[PDB]
DNA sequence: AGAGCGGGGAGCCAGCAGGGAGCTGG
RNA sequence: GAGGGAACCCACU
DNA sequence: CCAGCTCCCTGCTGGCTCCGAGTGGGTTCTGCCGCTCT
């Protein structure tokens, strides 16, 4: 009870103390959303800004904007994400 | 109101106070010295210059500033060569106009029953507690601050001191 | 005695596949073996690597500078996919491969570790105004 | 202590052998995989002492296209190394007609030393290595691929099949570890083959920069 | 044991160790006059790393007039009989690795502080 | 409470528990009452002396226990029992504190003169 | 003996002895208040030539701005030497680790500026404003002239237009200053 | 272990950063040395 | 998020006071000036700070807490909004009568009872 | 007299002092 | 069938 | 024999640039009061 345990439901209602504790620990959320948006933006700013213009060329490969090869093909495969799905190999776990 | 009401009745002759007196040589000596603050109610003066009563709804209606003028008695003393000392009394010399928290002591709403504040056109329920400047109600937000003339010792981290006491 | 970047280490034996060391036995079958494995607080990587049984061949650091300088471009490459899936799949999110392939392969195309700042967006061959229009305007077109 | 730095010994001859097959020199399967029992019969037990000397440690390798390609693998008994220990290798080098060697050193080189070395590159190319680098082979460990130096040919045919420039490759450094284990110099490309999670194999090609 | 500091008497200063080689001893000498006096301890400086393992004498017999602190009256006093007694643990730096109590006798004129 | 008591631990627990019900002990001794009264504050030993004046002699040493607690920069002169001493001395601080509570409240208030803003009324054409 | 009878109240303490002696042996060299004063001027604001001026300005740092609150009148050192030996006992107690360090979020740390304080601080400025200019005015008209008149000497404006301006803007300062 | 993960370890790994805040190893063991609790 | 806070209800931040009364009421409460001792008493009594200035030592801080506390409670020289800590552990009597000092009312317990009564 | 106008952190980089080999000179 | 900017504050997702 | 002096490694200190996206609404201030001259 002193460190912060809540033995109560929400139906019950919340002792003051318990109440207090609550408080304290839901405004660590809101401080947690308030200061991770700021630097999660620049992350995405600067992953976007690092990468924009690498794309896949009429060749199959994947380049930038200097035309220096990042992938000889894209994913390693030459596929694109939105069709390919989760599957098992067969012949991978059982024994001989 | 507390806050303000300390400012006005203590703070202000008290910054007045120690403040030190001017001495001013080229000669002749000019020693200023100003001793006793007067605030009057807040008070309107219109271009004709004759004074009346502000009320809170004309200083919102009308974009006044909701304030009252503020008065110093001060002394000049003259010190020539071969002369005795020469008293000059400046009584109640007007140096500036204080703004005043509404439902404070020196607003002309304290002590107004509701009836009284009613018809003056204010709400007995305002509470008060903020200030009329151009016609808008302005509230002086609370600071917090370090305390003072208290030791408080931390441990500065990455730096060159493992620990520091601070006053 | 010991390595002097090293502070503490940490054995433990993992009750996880995460961490074991998986084999084909003699039927065939992939077996996890419950095998003590130590973790440290500081990375000397190299010098861990050469002490006596110590496994060269899996030991690893999550340092990506040190793996870079000790293991080379591709096996940061591969180090850099494995932390970034460990943060991304911590949550039990999924994230397709070639995204995270394509992130790698971008910070390590030019040979050395180019970070996802001004330090390593902008010193590349890109034009200056790919690189004004990320970060440090006036001072790319100044040097342009 | 005599037996740790013995096993520091055989650790590095086997790392450096272990390099000089990969790199094409004729390193046959008996002085692959030997012990440190055979080690210590060869050479000796008390390197302090003197009984494993590294003056006589020094390998002498011969490439398999070409056998009057040979390379040496010099091992300093100093623990820094200056410029005379460069030059009486580079003098032993001369008198035995040979512009290849690596300097297997214990704490490292004088920057006058690698200075010399990089002046001397264009006739004989003397690799830098510390003792520390090589008490594992790193190109065994799991996060390094498969490194294959390519031919000039195999390049070309890469630059025609792709319709690259070499400056569009991506890139390696010569300084890079596994590039310092190959022995590449500027302009080489390295095949990389590596497993892939979606493809199942892939292979990348990095120009040395 | 400690070595604390021994000081001058010309000008109330620091006493610094130093030597005489003509009688061999050891002497605490004044570096602002010029006093000297043979020294008592040899020990010059000594480091405890380890010496912390008592924290009693820190402890003041005021904390029984403290209303915050826990008491319990299972834990009689061993110097004067008194049933109850405040207990806490230590409040240093050095309480980390331990969750130790120490007991104060809440009776006046005592003050006797104990562990367990 | 996982303890058993005797009749004497259990009637001065009870009493040790509420020593303000006690208005007159009737005829018990105090080495019966010794235990009850020592966990006791020194207002509750005058109540119960001064309705229970038989005591007063045999309580004395008691009185010692509160003196050292109250006044533990002290000692008794010759001619003074512990009551009598923490009376008096009881007595004089309190009289000490009033006649500062007089002084402190007259000689800041009344005494001297403080400076603060006074109303004006004035409705000067210094500001036109 | 003086100093560390300042700092260290317990004498049989020995691990506070152990920490203050490296600040004694560093600050051996120094021995007497002239040479000290001396120290502490030539580090100054501006260190002055004359080494009387570095005295003087030693002093009033010592005694004006070192420590208000504990005095700021004359030959009131030994309460402001029995504060700084407090300071310096509060280090040692947290140095080793005797004291609990203290906490910048316990609210019992912080004080709250109301209208009254920051109104006083936007007054004082303002005032020490008006007598500058007050002070200016007069001077002018004692150089060339003899005499002044106080009423057209005062600016009503700084105290009144300032506190309108901060009031009306939030900007807590001066409007030249507003940044 | 207190090994960072989330947003500030995706911050110190696309920013290339030489001070991570908790660097780490896995050390594996060859052998019997990885079988016994001692000679680990 | 944090760092725009509200008041509670009851919470009533101090206004100021002079520290005079209660400087004169310690300076004849045996309570001994900083000028007037030697350090060596230092050591077993009690600082006595008042708003953050060391004015003395006390030999007997129980009773003269008991003392303030009762001063402060029927509102004599002592001011309702002072505020009076005693540290004991570190041997300390800190007195505040400065402004910004956020309080609220509670109700004063003596011996497990309140002194808050039916009348 | 009175109208209009001049006067917080967090992490990169380079640039300096300190070191420590090593050629020329006696 | 359309003549200011700037600063600050509050708020919204 | 052995003292002499120059030029690359490391380390400390200072500068320097970055810090989510998009919306409403408000108030205030720009743009100032001494003039020298007729
Ligand atoms: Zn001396
Ligand atoms: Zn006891």
Same mark, same amino acid.
């Given at each position: 009870?002193?460190?912060?345990?809540?033995?109560?439901?929400?139906?019950?209602?919340?002792?003051?103390?318990?109440?207090?504790?609550?408080?304290?620990?839901?405004?660590?959320?809101?401080?947690?959303?308030?200061?991770?948006?700021?630097?999660?933006?620049?992350?995405?700013?600067?992953?976007?800004?690092?990468?924009?213009?690498?794309?896949?060329?009429?060749?199959?490969?994947?380049?930038?904007?200097?035309?220096?090869?990042?992938?000889?093909?894209?994913?390693?495969?030459?596929?694109?994400?939105?069709?390919?799905?989760?599957?098992?190999?067969?012949?991978?776990?059982?024994?001989? | 109101?507390?806050?303000?009401?300390? !400012?006005?009745?203590?703070?202000?002759?008290?910054?007045?106070?120690?403040?030190?007196?001017?001495?001013?040589?080229?000669?002749?000596?000019?020693?200023?010295? !100003?001793?006793?603050?007067?605030?009057?109610?807040?008070?309107?003066?219109?271009?004709?210059?004759?004074?009346?009563?502000?009320?809170?709804?004309?200083?919102?209606?009308?974009?006044?500033?909701?304030?009252?003028?503020?008065?110093?008695?001060?002394?000049?003393?003259?010190?020539?060569?071969?002369?005795?000392?020469?008293?000059?009394?400046?009584?109640?010399? !007007?140096?500036?106009?204080?703004?005043?928290?509404?439902?404070?002591?020196?607003?002309?709403?304290?002590?107004?029953?509701?009836?009284?504040?009613?018809?003056?056109?204010?709400?007995?329920?305002?509470?008060?507690?903020?200030?009329?400047?151009?016609?808008?109600?302005?509230?002086?937000?609370?600071?917090?601050?370090?305390?003072?003339?208290?030791?408080?010792?931390?441990?500065?981290?990455?730096?060159?001191?493992?620990?520091?006491?601070?006053? | 005695?010991?390595?002097?970047?090293?502070?503490?280490?940490?054995?433990? +034996?993992?009750?996880?596949?995460?961490?074991?060391?998986?084999?084909?036995?003699?039927?065939?079958?992939?077996?996890?073996?419950?095998?003590?494995?130590?973790?440290?607080?500081?990375?000397?990587?190299?010098?861990?690597?050469?002490?006596?049984?110590?496994?060269?061949?899996?030991?690893?650091?999550?340092?990506?500078?040190?793996?870079?300088?000790?293991?080379?471009?591709?096996?940061?490459?591969?180090? +850099?996919?494995?932390?970034?899936?460990?943060?991304?799949?911590?949550?039990?999110?999924?994230?397709?491969?070639?995204?995270?392939?394509?992130?790698?392969?971008?910070?390590?195309?030019?040979?050395?570790?180019?970070?996802?700042?001004?330090?390593?967006?902008?010193?590349?061959?890109?034009?200056?105004?790919?690189?004004?229009?990320?970060?440090?305007?006036?001072?790319? +077109?100044?040097?342009? | 202590?005599?037996? $740790?730095?013995?096993?520091?010994?055989?650790?590095?001859?086997?790392?450096?052998?272990?390099?000089?097959?990969?790199?094409?020199?004729?390193?046959?399967?008996?002085?692959?995989?030997?012990?440190?029992?055979?080690?210590?019969?060869?050479?000796?037990?008390?390197?302090?002492?003197?009984?494993?000397?590294?003056?006589?440690?020094?390998?002498?390798?011969?490439?398999?296209?070409?056998?009057?390609?040979?390379?040496?693998?010099?091992?300093?008994?100093?623990?820094?190394?200056?410029?005379?220990?460069?030059?009486?290798?580079?003098?032993?080098?001369?008198?035995?007609?040979?512009?290849?060697?690596?300097?297997?050193?214990?704490?490292?080189?004088?920057?006058?030393?690698?200075?010399?070395?990089?002046?001397?590159?264009?006739?004989?190319?003397?690799?830098?290595?510390?003792?520390?680098?090589?008490?594992?082979?790193?190109?065994?460990?799991?996060?390094?691929? $498969?490194?294959?130096?390519?031919?000039?040919?195999?390049?070309?045919?890469?630059?025609?099949?792709?319709?690259?420039?070499?400056?569009?490759?991506?890139?390696?450094?010569?300084?890079?570890?596994?590039?310092?284990?190959?022995?590449?110099?500027?302009?080489?490309?390295?095949?990389?083959?590596?497993?892939?999670?979606?493809?199942?194999?892939?292979?990348?090609?990095?120009?040395?920069? | 044991?400690?070595?604390?500091?021994?000081?001058?008497?010309?000008?109330?200063?620091?006493?610094?160790?130093?030597?005489?080689?003509?009688?061999?001893?050891?002497?605490?000498?004044?570096?602002?006059?010029?006093?000297?006096?043979?020294?008592?301890?040899?020990?010059?400086?000594?480091?405890?790393?380890?010496?912390?393992?008592?924290?009693?004498?820190?402890?003041?017999?005021?904390?029984?007039?403290?209303?915050?602190?826990?008491?319990?009256?299972?834990?009689?006093?061993?110097?004067?009989?008194?049933?109850?007694?405040?207990?806490?643990?230590?409040?240093?730096?050095?309480?980390?690795?331990?969750?130790?109590?120490?007991?104060?006798?809440?009776?006046?004129?005592?003050?006797?502080?104990?562990?367990? | 409470?996982?303890?058993?008591?005797?009749?004497?631990?259990?009637?001065?627990?009870?009493?040790?528990?509420?020593?303000?019900?006690?208005?007159?002990?009737?005829?018990?001794?105090?080495?019966?009452?010794?235990?009850?009264?020592?966990?006791?504050?020194?207002?509750?030993?005058?109540?119960?002396?001064?309705?229970?004046?038989?005591?007063?002699?045999?309580?004395?040493?008691?009185?010692?226990?509160?003196?050292?607690?109250?006044?533990?920069?002290?000692?008794?002169?010759?001619?003074?029992?512990?009551?009598?001493?923490?009376?008096?001395?009881?007595? %004089?601080?309190?009289?000490?504190?009033?006649?500062?509570?007089?002084?402190?409240?007259? %000689?800041? %208030?009344?005494?001297?003169?403080?400076?603060?803003?006074?109303? %004006?009324?004035?409705?000067?054409?210094?500001?036109? | 003996?003086?100093?560390?009878?300042?700092?260290?109240?317990?004498?049989?303490?020995?691990?506070?002895?152990?920490?203050?002696?490296?600040?004694?042996?560093?600050?051996?060299?120094?021995?007497?208040?002239?040479?000290?004063?001396?120290?502490?001027?030539?580090?100054?604001?501006?260190?002055?030539?004359?080494?009387?001026?570095?005295?003087?300005?030693?002093?009033?740092?010592?005694?004006?701005?070192?420590?208000?609150?504990?005095?700021?009148?004359?030959?009131?050192?030994?309460?402001?030497?029995?504060?700084?030996?407090?300071?310096?006992? /509060?280090?040692?107690?947290?140095?080793?680790?005797? /004291?609990?360090?203290?906490?910048?979020?316990?609210?019992?740390?912080?004080?709250?500026?109301?209208?009254?304080?920051?109104?006083?601080?936007?007054?004082?400025?303002?005032?020490?404003?008006?007598?500058?200019?007050? /002070?200016?005015?007069?001077?002018?008209?004692?150089?060339?002239?003899?005499?002044?008149?106080?009423?057209?000497?005062?600016?009503?404006?700084?105290?009144?237009?300032?506190?309108?301006?901060?009031?009306?803007?939030?900007?807590?300062?001066?409007?030249?200053?507003?940044? | 272990?207190?090994?960072?993960?989330?947003?500030?370890?995706?911050?110190?790994?696309?920013?290339?950063?030489?001070?991570?805040?908790?660097?780490?190893?896995?050390?594996?063991?060859?052998?019997?040395?990885?079988?016994?609790?001692?000679?680990? | 998020?944090?760092?725009?806070?509200?008041?509670?209800?009851?919470?009533?931040?101090?206004?100021?006071?002079?520290?005079?009364?209660?400087?004169?009421?310690?300076?004849?409460?045996?309570?001994?000036?900083?000028?007037?001792?030697?350090?060596?008493?230092?050591?077993?009594?009690?600082?006595?700070?008042?708003?953050?200035?060391?004015?003395?030592?006390?030999?007997?801080?129980?009773?003269?807490?008991?003392?303030?506390?009762?001063?402060?409670?029927?509102?004599?020289?002592?001011?309702?909004?002072?505020?009076?800590?005693?540290?004991?552990?570190?041997?300390?009597?800190?007195?505040?009568?400065?402004?910004?000092?956020?309080?609220?009312?509670?109700?004063?317990?003596?011996?497990?009872?309140?002194?808050?009564?039916?009348?």
């Amino acid at each position: 009870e002193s460190r912060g345990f809540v033995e109560n439901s929400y139906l019950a209602g919340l002792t003051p103390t318990e109440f207090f504790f609550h408080a304290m620990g839901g405004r660590e959320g809101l401080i947690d959303t308030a200061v991770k948006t700021a630097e999660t933006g620049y992350i995405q700013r600067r992953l976007i800004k690092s990468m924009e213009s690498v794309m896949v060329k009429y060749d199959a490969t994947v380049r930038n904007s200097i035309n220096q090869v990042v992938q000889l093909r894209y994913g390693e495969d030459g596929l694109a994400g939105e069709s390919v799905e989760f599957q098992n190999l067969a012949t991978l776990k059982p024994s001989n | 109101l507390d806050s303000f009401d300390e !400012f006005i009745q203590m703070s202000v002759q008290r910054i007045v106070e120690d403040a030190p007196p001017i001495d001013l040589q080229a000669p002749p000596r000019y020693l200023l010295k !100003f001793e006793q603050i007067y605030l009057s109610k807040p008070t309107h003066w219109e271009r004709d210059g004759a004074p009346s009563p502000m009320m809170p709804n004309e200083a919102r209606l009308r974009n006044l500033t909701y304030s009252a003028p503020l008065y110093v008695d001060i002394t000049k003393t003259v010190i020539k060569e071969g002369e005795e000392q020469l008293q000059t009394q400046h009584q109640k010399t !007007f140096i500036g106009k204080i703004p005043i928290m509404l439902r404070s002591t020196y607003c002309l709403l304290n002590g107004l029953t509701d009836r009284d504040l009613c018809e003056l056109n204010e709400c007995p329920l305002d509470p008060g507690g903020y200030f009329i400047i151009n016609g808008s109600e302005k509230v002086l937000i609370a600071q917090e601050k370090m305390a003072t003339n208290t030791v408080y010792v931390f441990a500065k981290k990455d730096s060159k001191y493992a620990y520091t006491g601070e006053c | 005695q010991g390595i002097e970047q090293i502070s503490k280490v940490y054995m433990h +034996l993992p009750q996880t596949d995460n961490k074991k060391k998986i084999i084909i036995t003699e039927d065939g079958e992939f077996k996890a073996l419950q095998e003590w494995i130590l973790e440290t607080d500081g990375v000397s990587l190299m010098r861990v690597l050469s002490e006596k049984d110590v496994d060269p061949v899996r030991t690893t650091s999550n340092d990506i500078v040190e793996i870079f300088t000790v293991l080379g471009i591709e096996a940061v490459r591969k180090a +850099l996919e494995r932390e970034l899936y460990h943060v991304i799949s911590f949550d039990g999110s999924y994230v397709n491969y070639r995204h995270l392939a394509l992130l790698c392969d971008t910070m390590t195309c030019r040979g050395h570790l180019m970070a996802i700042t001004r330090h390593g967006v902008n010193r590349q061959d890109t034009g200056p105004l790919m690189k004004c229009s990320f970060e440090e305007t006036v001072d790319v +077109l100044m040097e342009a | 202590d005599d037996e $740790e730095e013995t096993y520091r010994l055989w650790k590095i001859r086997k790392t450096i052998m272990q390099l000089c097959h990969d790199r094409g020199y004729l390193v046959t399967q008996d002085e692959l995989d030997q012990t440190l029992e055979e080690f210590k019969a060869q050479f000796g037990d008390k390197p302090s002492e003197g009984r494993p000397r590294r003056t006589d440690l020094t390998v002498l390798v011969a490439h398999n296209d070409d056998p009057t390609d040979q390379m040496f693998v010099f091992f300093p008994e100093e623990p820094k190394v200056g410029i005379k220990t460069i030059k009486v290798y580079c003098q032993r080098m001369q008198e035995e007609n040979i512009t290849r060697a690596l300097i297997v050193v214990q704490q490292g080189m004088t920057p006058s030393a690698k200075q010399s070395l990089v002046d001397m590159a264009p006739k004989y190319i003397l690799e830098q290595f510390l003792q520390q680098e090589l008490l594992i082979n790193i190109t065994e460990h799991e996060l390094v691929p $498969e490194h294959v130096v390519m031919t000039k040919e195999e390049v070309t045919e890469l630059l025609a099949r792709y319709k690259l420039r070499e400056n569009q490759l991506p890139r390696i450094q010569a300084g890079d570890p596994v590039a310092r284990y190959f022995g590449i110099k500027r302009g080489q490309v390295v095949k990389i083959i590596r497993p892939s999670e979606t493809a199942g194999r892939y292979i990348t090609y990095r120009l040395v920069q | 044991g400690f070595v604390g500091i021994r000081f001058c008497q010309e000008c109330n200063n620091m006493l610094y160790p130093k030597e005489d080689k003509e009688n061999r001893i050891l002497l605490y000498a004044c570096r602002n006059c010029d006093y000297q006096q043979e020294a008592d301890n040899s020990c010059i400086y000594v480091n405890k790393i380890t010496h912390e393992v008592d924290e009693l004498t820190q402890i003041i017999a005021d904390v029984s007039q403290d209303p915050t602190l826990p008491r319990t009256e299972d834990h009689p006093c061993q110097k004067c009989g008194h049933k109850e007694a405040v207990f806490f643990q230590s409040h240093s730096a050095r309480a980390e690795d331990a969750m130790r109590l120490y007991y104060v006798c809440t009776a006046p004129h005592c003050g006797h502080r104990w562990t367990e | 409470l996982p303890k058993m008591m005797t009749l004497h631990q259990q009637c001065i627990r009870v009493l040790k528990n509420n020593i303000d019900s006690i208005f007159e002990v009737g005829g018990v001794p105090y080495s019966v009452l010794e235990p009850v009264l020592e966990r006791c504050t020194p207002d509750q030993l005058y109540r119960i002396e001064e309705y229970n004046h038989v005591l007063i002699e045999e309580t004395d040493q008691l009185w010692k226990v509160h003196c050292h607690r109250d006044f533990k920069e002290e000692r008794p002169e010759e001619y003074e029992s512990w009551r009598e001493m923490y009376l008096r001395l009881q007595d %004089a601080r309190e009289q000490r504190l009033r006649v500062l509570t007089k002084n402190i409240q007259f %000689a800041h %208030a009344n005494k001297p003169k403080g400076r603060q803003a006074k109303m %004006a009324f004035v409705n000067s054409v210094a500001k036109p | 003996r003086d100093i560390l009878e300042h700092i260290i109240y317990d004498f049989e303490d020995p691990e506070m002895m152990e920490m203050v002696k490296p600040s004694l042996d560093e600050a051996f060299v120094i021995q007497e208040q002239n040479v000290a004063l001396n120290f502490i001027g030539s580090r100054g604001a501006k260190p002055g030539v004359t080494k009387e001026k570095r005295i003087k300005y030693a002093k009033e740092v010592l005694q004006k701005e070192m420590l208000p609150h504990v005095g700021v009148s004359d030959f009131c050192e030994t309460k402001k030497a029995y504060f700084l030996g407090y300071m310096v006992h /509060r280090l040692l107690l947290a140095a080793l680790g005797r /004291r609990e360090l203290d906490d910048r979020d316990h609210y019992g740390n912080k004080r709250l500026d109301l209208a009254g304080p920051l109104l006083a601080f936007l007054f004082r400025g303002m005032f020490k404003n008006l007598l500058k200019e007050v /002070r200016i005015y007069a001077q002018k008209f004692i150089d060339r002239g003899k005499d002044f008149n106080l009423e057209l000497a005062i600016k009503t404006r700084i105290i009144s237009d300032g506190l309108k301006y901060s009031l009306a803007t939030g900007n807590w300062g001066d409007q030249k200053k507003a940044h | 272990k207190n090994v960072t993960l989330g947003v500030p370890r995706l911050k110190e790994l696309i920013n290339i950063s030489k001070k991570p805040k908790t660097p780490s190893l896995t050390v594996f063991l060859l052998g019997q040395s990885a079988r016994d609790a001692e000679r680990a | 998020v944090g760092l725009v806070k509200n008041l509670a209800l009851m919470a009533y931040i101090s206004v100021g006071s002079q520290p005079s009364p209660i400087l004169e009421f310690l300076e004849e409460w045996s309570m001994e000036n900083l000028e007037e001792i030697s350090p060596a008493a230092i050591a077993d009594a009690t600082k006595i700070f008042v708003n953050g200035c060391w004015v003395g030592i006390h030999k007997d801080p129980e009773q003269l807490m008991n003392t303030l506390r009762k001063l402060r409670r029927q509102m004599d020289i002592i001011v309702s909004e002072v505020s009076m800590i005693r540290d004991i552990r570190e041997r300390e009597i800190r007195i505040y009568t400065d402004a910004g000092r956020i309080c609220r009312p509670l109700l004063i317990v003596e011996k497990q009872k309140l002194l808050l009564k039916k009348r």
